[PDB]
Design a protein around this nucleic acid. Structure first.
Ligand code: MG
Ligand code: MG
Ligand code: NA
Length: 327
DNA sequence: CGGCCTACG
DNA sequence: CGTAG
DNA sequence: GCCG
């Protein structure tokens, strides 16, 4: 009754097992900080199964038969049901390793590998890193300077204002080009830690060379606090605030219109949903999916899609709107 | 046991 | 190495 | 860590 892949079931943004899923996600995150991608995936998948359930789990019984619940994830749930806390989860939460790896990986320009090296070198705080600025790339310097602003969520109000400024630059760069809001906001989130836009043009090929032209125009308007032929730009933008402004992460992506459904699908997420969807495509259907297309490796052909609905149909999956992709 | 998404900057 | 979802 |  519960399918094994997250792309086979609706997953709403809000649900009935919030505390249980949050605890499993702490363990998933900690597994990632240790380089255990397999354990991260299992804990993420188990958390996502709980998000997809129609009511709260109240008894351990109710996990029997659910995919991705074995001895470890079931024991976590059991401890939470019986005591309101799970000792393993709380030990992770308060550990110096978890807290520092979380802080460091939050920095734009710092991943697990860099964070882990710094941790092993004895660094623990953002001010530790600031004192050693020759250890830092230009990207990391920007991430560190702007870390406080980037730690505060963006509201949907802010997003609409940003979209209008991006649309103005895009229209000068290439009249007729369009801007679509993707990422978590397209899935219905009311807040988020960045904003994602997908840009195309209805005439195939006109979008070639577009992103540099857009970036130059936004920089000329004084809106770009940090960036840098290309088709994805990971920026920090100046967002107006009453009497001042704040830094916001914005991603801009260009795709040809032939690829737009695939890029829209990919950039709308969630991250787990897209990993599960690509895994399903390859392992169950023998087709290879990315943000550019869907390849049949036996006929050596690409599926044409005119819509996300087309892609779900190609893959034999019932359509899920973005609001049900919150795996 | 092997496998765990698949790209671009 | 970083980034994305 | 779990699935197949
Ligand atoms: Mg986003
Ligand atoms: Mg983003
Ligand atoms: Na980071």
């Amino acid at each position: 009754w519960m399918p094994a892949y997250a792309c086979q079931r609706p997953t709403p943004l809000t649900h009935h097992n919030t505390g249980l899923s949050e605890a499993l996600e702490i363990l998933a995150e900690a597994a990632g900080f240790e380089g255990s991608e397999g354990r991260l995936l299992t804990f993420c998948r188990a958390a996502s199964v709980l998000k997809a359930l129609p009511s709260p789990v109240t008894t351990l019984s109710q996990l029997q038969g659910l995919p991705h619940f074995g001895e470890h994830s079931s024991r976590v749930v059991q401890e939470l049901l019986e005591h309101g806390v799970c000792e393993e989860v709380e030990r992770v939460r308060r550990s110096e390793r978890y807290q520092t790896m979380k802080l460091f990986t939050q920095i734009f320009g710092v991943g697990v590998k860099t964070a882990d090296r710094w941790y092993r070198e004895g660094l623990r705080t953002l001010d530790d890193l600031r004192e050693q600025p020759q250890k830092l790339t230009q990207q990391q310097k920007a991430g560190l300077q702007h870390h406080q602003d980037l730690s505060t969520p963006v509201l949907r109000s802010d997003v609409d204002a940003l979209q209008q400024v991006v649309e103005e630059a895009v229209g000068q760069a290439l009249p007729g080009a369009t801007v679509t809001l993707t990422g978590g906001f397209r899935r219905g989130k009311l807040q988020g830690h960045d904003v994602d836009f997908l840009i195309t043009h209805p005439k195939e090929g006109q979008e070639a060379g577009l992103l540099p032209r857009v970036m130059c125009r936004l920089q000329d308007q004084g809106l770009i606090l940090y960036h840098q032929a290309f088709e994805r730009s990971f920026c920090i933008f100046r967002l107006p605030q009453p009497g001042s402004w704040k830094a916001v992460r914005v991603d801009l992506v260009v795709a040809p219109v032939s690829q737009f459904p695939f890029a829209l699908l990919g950039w709308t997420g969630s991250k787990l949903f897209q990993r599960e969807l690509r895994r399903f495509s390859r392992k169950e259907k023998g087709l290879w999916l990315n943000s550019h297309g869907l390849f049949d490796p036996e006929q050596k052909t690409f599926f044409q899609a005119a819509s996300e609905e087309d892609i779900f149909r190609h893959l034999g999956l019932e359509y899920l709107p973005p609001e049900q992709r919150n795996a």
